[PDB]
Amino acid sequence: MKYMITSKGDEKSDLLRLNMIAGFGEYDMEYDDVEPEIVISIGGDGTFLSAFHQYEERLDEIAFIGIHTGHLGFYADWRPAEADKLVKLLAKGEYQKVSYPLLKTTVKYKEATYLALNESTVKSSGGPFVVDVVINDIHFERFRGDGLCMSTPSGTTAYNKSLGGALMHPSIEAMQLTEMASINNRVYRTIGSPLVFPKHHVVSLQPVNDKDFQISVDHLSILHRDVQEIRYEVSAKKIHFARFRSFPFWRRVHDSFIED
Amino acid sequence: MKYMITSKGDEKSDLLRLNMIAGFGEYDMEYDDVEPEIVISIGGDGTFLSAFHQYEERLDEIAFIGIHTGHLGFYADWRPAEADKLVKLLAKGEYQKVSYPLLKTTVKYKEATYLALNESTVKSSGGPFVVDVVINDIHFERFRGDGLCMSTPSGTTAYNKSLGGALMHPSIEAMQLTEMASINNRVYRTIGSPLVFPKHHVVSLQPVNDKDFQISVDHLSILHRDVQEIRYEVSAKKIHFARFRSFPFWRRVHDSFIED
Amino acid sequence: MKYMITSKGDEKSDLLRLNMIAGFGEYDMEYDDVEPEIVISIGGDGTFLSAFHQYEERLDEIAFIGIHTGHLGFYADWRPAEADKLVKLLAKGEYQKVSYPLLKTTVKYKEATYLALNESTVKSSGGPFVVDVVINDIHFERFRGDGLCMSTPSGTTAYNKSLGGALMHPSIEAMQLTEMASINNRVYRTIGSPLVFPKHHVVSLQPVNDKDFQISVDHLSILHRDVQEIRYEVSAKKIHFARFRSFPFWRRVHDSFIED
Amino acid sequence: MKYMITSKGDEKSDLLRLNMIAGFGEYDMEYDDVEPEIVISIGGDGTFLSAFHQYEERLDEIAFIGIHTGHLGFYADWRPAEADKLVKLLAKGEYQKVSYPLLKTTVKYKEATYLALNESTVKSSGGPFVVDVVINDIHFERFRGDGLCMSTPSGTTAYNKSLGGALMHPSIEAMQLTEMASINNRVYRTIGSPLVFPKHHVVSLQPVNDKDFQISVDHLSILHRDVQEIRYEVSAKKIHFARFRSFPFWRRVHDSFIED
Numbered sequence A, B, C, D: 001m002k003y004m005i006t007s008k009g010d011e012k013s014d015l016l017r018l019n020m021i022a023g024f025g026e027y028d029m030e031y032d033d034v035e036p037e038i039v040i041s042i043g044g045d046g047t048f049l050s051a052f053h054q055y056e057e058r059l060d061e062i063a064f065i066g067i068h069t070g071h072l073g074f075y076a077d078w079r080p081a082e083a084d085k086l087v088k089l090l091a092k093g094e095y096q097k098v099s100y101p102l103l104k105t106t107v108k109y110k111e112a113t114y115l116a117l118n119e120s121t122v123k124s125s126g127g128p129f130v131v132d133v134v135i136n137d138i139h140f141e142r143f144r145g146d147g148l149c150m151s152t153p154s155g156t157t158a159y160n161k162s163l164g165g166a167l168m169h170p171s172i173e174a175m176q177l178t179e180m181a182s183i184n185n186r187v188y189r190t191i192g193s194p195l196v197f198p199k200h201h202v203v204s205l206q207p208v209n210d211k212d213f214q215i216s217v218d219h220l221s222i223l224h225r226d227v228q229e230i231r232y233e234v235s236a237k238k239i240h241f242a243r244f245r246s247f248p249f250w251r252r253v254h255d256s257f258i259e260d
């Protein structure tokens, strides 16, 4: 089975990568970073993010594995000392697949589309941030403030969390929108609360004056000029994980935030 | 078709109720508050809550209608001046059904079960509130504070909202747990963020010292003594609404909180 | 110099108390719990609270000392192993005084007055909590929700903190009001933000319907019936601490919440 | 008495400015925008901000007046239709002075100092924002997130408010620090709560890796490279308002946020 391995780049991660490759050499496993069926990421959640985007064009043909070298990561839930056990199980195909929902972002000017594993956020180019929020073609509110964040289920433990958003189990096909320092006057009104949308619901952000926005997708952040619309919806695409043992999302949340 | 009508009790509501009954008299409609197929609530969301609990034993045989007399209610989304149009459509059966998820609460000592349309909350009898939160048999945290609130999707716009919870579209089969003034020390740790659970996930609250709790279910609030466990899960039962026109949840949220 | 010692009641605290008394016996120190000039509290912040209220009638003649036996307390900032050094310094009068502001609460029906070291809160007797907030005789808002909390500066690290309140340096003569799960509709409006008031500002809570309130003052909580007004203001009275070394408030905040 | 008038620039504001000048011509009043004793700002709070910074070098020789043309502003608390009454009172010197505290910001690389009427905030140049917070020379925390905001008392109703900060009466000489989307892990810890500092307390932000910061002061925002320290403290300088009638801060808060 074709596979590839990305690395954080530091000494610890590269040597672990080299050892796993040597181990894979003792099995019927072909290293291939062009069309792998298995992508192993060694490092943190930031390394896993990169691995995901590196292969976002063939998400349906890939099963991802995360190794943390590293504090306990949400995506990288494998200890380094378990690497040898890992190469074994991967070789004999003793694993099933677990899928998480993704977020689709469409920027219309032409138009560009992006896929997020964590979230996509929108900010202004420097001036004040003012946008109209439209839900399924119905004007919901005019948001004034620092920006808006639209998170996937697995992304709720990231940026979303810092903004007061709720943590959602990744078996729920939804996206969550949170506010960033909204102005609430006797003249300016936002909902304040995070909003959780189901599949097929479309949230559209529309410029009021300034048409330039700094739009981020996970770790990537690009300036978009002359934007007519930003469109959010639960993607039809999903990310597939290879799971060899039980590591429940809530236990992962506990170990990362409460006590490990 | 059998039907019944509850009223807020004030002059406006009772007279509207009497007029609708007279109108139903002009059709093949039998008033029956023992086995109605249609329950019409005239008043506010508090009146609708009562109507729901009054008939929670036959939820699968009933379609609910809410009339607000009344500011725009989340459950009571019919204007009084539309009552005559309402009686018409109900008579000719020109309506489909919309269902919302419900919350099941199980209190073990024996055990009692309750059904919530909005939420179920837990507080102490007076002393400090300390409970262990267990998710699917795994200890998640030890909560210290004022209490915990477990909300249905449609209930997220109620008490849940005041506690910083997210608003969830009621087509999502989930429950949301929020904290009430949790103590977060260098010794006491809670997740802080709201938690959204899917169907079949079980959240269990377990006493640490005091075994007495003030437990609320929607408008009802009873003291429970010698509690061994409080168990939350998305109910297998659902509430059924009769819908005659489009009134989207998000538009309802907008009209109630942003601008009507 | 007259002195007295209160104890948490457990083995550790009582024996420490007995040892300190024996140590004081080696100096010109008279034990007196009726008119002490020095009150030593051994236990936690809950024990210190009790010591304070036990002697709130002679606050200007007393210097308080807190010993934690015990995690690091905000009021009890002395390690048990430092007790012997403590008895020494207290005997030779090698200490200056540090004062913190207090909160005065006046309940009118007749009227009762209370003094708080941490905070005073107001809740309903069971029904909904609705009160008019009047600042210096000007109606500020009508609050609907679970309740209101008025905190002293040193109390801001307590209940106030759990409600989203700010931490205030105790050299600032002020009181801070925070909300408890306020309902914010398109019909019900509260400020949302905590409010910090200076000396001589008077905040008055006035019933709208229900005249019965559960009113707490620090650890004490009594039901008041037929209340006409609750009045908050920075007290003219202050609590006096005896300080032998530098232990800055912000360092105390750090050790309690960040890392000790 | 020397005076000057700034304007929002729109038709309404300029004509009001021209009329007031004509009115001042009927009295012993000399227009002078180089050394005015009275600065009148016509527009919004953004116009008042500009007027303040335009003359921040002679704050002790100036009394500011704000006219809103305009919704009710916090600094611009004069209705346009009251302009004629205003010119009268100003001419006869029938006014006393009210002073609000200011915030001093010192950026060391050399060093630059800035004065804020509302707040000063710090963000990263694009990468992650990581800084060490030092209070009076004692390391308090390592902040990871979007940024930090340090607000004056009168500024608490602005940006500070959107970040969950408390509203402080401007008679209190203090500054308030609030967080912007802080990361709180089991490895990263911030206080979370807003912090209110008194006069003479110094808060210092120190780079951990990236030494470049986008630093804002009210409406102004400049990038600073190779920063060694950002230092916050309550300024010795104060802004002076000319007051002709009672318009209490809390009433101003009410009219702006609750109901006008």
Ligand SMILES: [N-]=[N+]=NC[C@H]1O[C@@H](n2c(SCC(=O)NC[C@H]3O[C@@H](n4c(Br)nc5c(N)ncnc54)[C@H](O)[C@@H]3O)nc3c(N)ncnc32)[C@H](O)[C@@H]1O
Binding pocket: A044, A045, A046, A047, A049, A073, A074, A075, A118, A119, A154, A155, A156, A157, A158, A159, A160, A162, A217, A218, A219, D128, D144, D145, D146, D180, D181, D182, D183, D185
């Ligand atoms: N910057 N940053 N992130 C540091 C933390 O991000 C973590 N992380 C990561 S990836 C690490 C990384 O480099 N991430 C870039 C991410 O930082 C997040 N972020 C940003 Br941008 N601003 C943030 C902010 N202000 N607070 C918290 N997180 C923020 C946001 O999720 C963005 O995709 N993914 C998750 C996840 N799903 N759940 C919980 N944590 C996650 C890493 O473990 C690390 O601990």
Ligand SMILES: [N-]=[N+]=NC[C@H]1O[C@@H](n2c(SCC(=O)NC[C@H]3O[C@@H](n4c(Br)nc5c(N)ncnc54)[C@H](O)[C@@H]3O)nc3c(N)ncnc32)[C@H](O)[C@@H]1O
Binding pocket: B044, B045, B046, B047, B049, B073, B074, B075, B118, B119, B154, B155, B156, B157, B158, B159, B160, B162, B217, B218, B219, C128, C144, C145, C146, C180, C181, C182, C183, C185
């Ligand atoms: N108390 N109260 N509730 C007043 C508001 O509750 C509204 N309401 C109602 S029912 C009215 C009533 O009497 N409700 C009792 C409910 O009050 C809510 N509640 C409580 Br208890 N404490 C609250 C609090 N502190 N803040 C806000 N809501 C609170 C909680 O949802 C409880 O079930 N249902 C909803 C709903 N699903 N979404 C939004 N609003 C709802 C009514 O419209 C009314 O405006």
Ligand SMILES: [N-]=[N+]=NC[C@H]1O[C@@H](n2c(SCC(=O)NC[C@H]3O[C@@H](n4c(Br)nc5c(N)ncnc54)[C@H](O)[C@@H]3O)nc3c(N)ncnc32)[C@H](O)[C@@H]1O
Binding pocket: B128, B144, B145, B146, B180, B181, B182, B183, B185, C044, C045, C046, C047, C049, C073, C074, C075, C118, C119, C154, C155, C156, C157, C158, C159, C160, C162, C217, C218, C219
């Ligand atoms: N309940 N309780 N309190 C537990 C914590 O209170 C601490 N404490 C105490 S006293 C301990 C005690 O028994 N306190 C009763 C206090 O509990 C606080 N409280 C209440 Br009531 N409800 C709370 C809640 N929901 N969350 C946090 N604190 C709450 C409130 O301050 C009340 O006066 N004083 C302080 C203080 N000034 N700053 C920080 N912590 C303080 C103790 O150290 C203990 O860790």
Ligand SMILES: [N-]=[N+]=NC[C@H]1O[C@@H](n2c(SCC(=O)NC[C@H]3O[C@@H](n4c(Br)nc5c(N)ncnc54)[C@H](O)[C@@H]3O)nc3c(N)ncnc32)[C@H](O)[C@@H]1O
Binding pocket: A128, A144, A145, A146, A180, A181, A182, A183, A185, D044, D045, D046, D047, D049, D073, D074, D075, D118, D119, D154, D155, D156, D157, D158, D159, D160, D162, D217, D218, D219
């Ligand atoms: N951007 N903006 N501000 C719009 C509002 O700022 C108001 N304003 C102003 S000045 C208007 C303006 O142009 N201000 C620039 C200010 O915007 C504030 N600000 C920023 Br930057 N980001 C914000 C944000 N995300 N949310 C709220 N306010 C924000 C911040 O206070 C900054 O100094 N001062 C006050 C004040 N002291 N209290 C309350 N409101 C104030 C104006 O009335 C206007 O309604």
